[PDB]
From a paper:
Here, the high-resolution crystal structures of the human TNKS2 PARP domain in complex with 16 various PARP inhibitors are reported, including the compounds BSI-201, AZD-2281 and ABT-888, which are currently in Phase 2 or 3 clinical trials. Tankyrase enzymes are now appreciated to poly(ADP-ribosyl)ate (PARsylate) a number of target proteins which contain a common RXXPXG ARC-binding consensus sequence. While both TNKS1 and TNKS2 knockout mice are viable with a decreased body-weight phenotype, TNKS1/TNKS2 compound homozygote knockout mice are embryonically lethal by day 9.5, supporting genetic redundancy between the two proteins. Both TNKS and TNKS2 bind to and suppress Axin2, a negative regulator of β-catenin, suggesting that they may represent novel druggable targets for cancers dependent on active β-catenin. TNKS1 and TNKS2 also differ from other PARP family members in that they harbor a short zinc-binding motif containing residues Thr1079–His1093 within the catalytic domain.
DR-2313 is a potent, water-soluble competitive PARP inhibitor. It is also the first PARP inhibitor that does not contain a benzamide substructure, which had previously been thought to be essential for good binding to PARP enzymes. In DR-2313, the amide group is fused into the B ring, a modification that improved the binding potency. The IC50 value for DR-2313 from our study is about ten times better than the value for 3-AB. In addition to the three conserved hydrogen bonds associated with the B ring, and the π-stacking with Tyr1071, the bulkier S atom from the A ring also displays hydrophobic interactions with Glu1138, Lys1067, Phe1061 and Tyr1060.
Numbering used by the authors: 963 to 1160
Write the structure that this text describes.
Amino acid sequence: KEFQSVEEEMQSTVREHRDGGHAGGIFNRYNILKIQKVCNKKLWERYTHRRKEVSEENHNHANERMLFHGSPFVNAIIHKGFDERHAYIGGMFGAGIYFAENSSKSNQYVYGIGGGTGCPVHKDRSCYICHRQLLFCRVTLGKSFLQFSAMKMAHSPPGHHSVTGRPSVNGLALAEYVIYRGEQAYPEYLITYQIMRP
Ligand SMILES: Cc1nc2c(c(=O)[nH]1)CSCC2
Ligand SMILES: [Zn+2]
């Protein structure tokens, strides 16, 4: 039932992307192959210690959410954790770690920014053959700064613990959530899947 809940979140949050599938491929659903619960006690303690600290700074509320993260470095993340030292100021909300509430938005980043050159075997961003991996993460948002337009920051805004990118006509199509401290996310589930041909 635990993994069925994860499959449901993965499938139901798929959306039609404005780039016509350029970055992540053309699909309406996935073929979910594996769902593995990541058990990293040192990373979990780092996460819960920070979560308690954020809660005390946000009226006894962590404002935790389960969010997706796509990256070519998922295997490094499950072992070493999220690391803001690998984040650079170039992004929409600057040098943060980015998460999506729509799995298909995170799928656009599995092979790199804008989908890179796609899978290493066929160099195809819309590869239906190669197995992809996504993370479904615990993310502590705390006091989240609501923002619509690009704001390149190095750290959370003063008094805040994260940034929420909200959709707008000139801006974002879908929401995104940005943390500036790696310990504010835990890679709880490793999802192995394929995008499926419509
Ligand atoms: C690397 C990466 N970036 C983003 C996302 C992601 O999953 N990975 C989703 S929100 C937009 C940016
Ligand atoms: Zn491939």
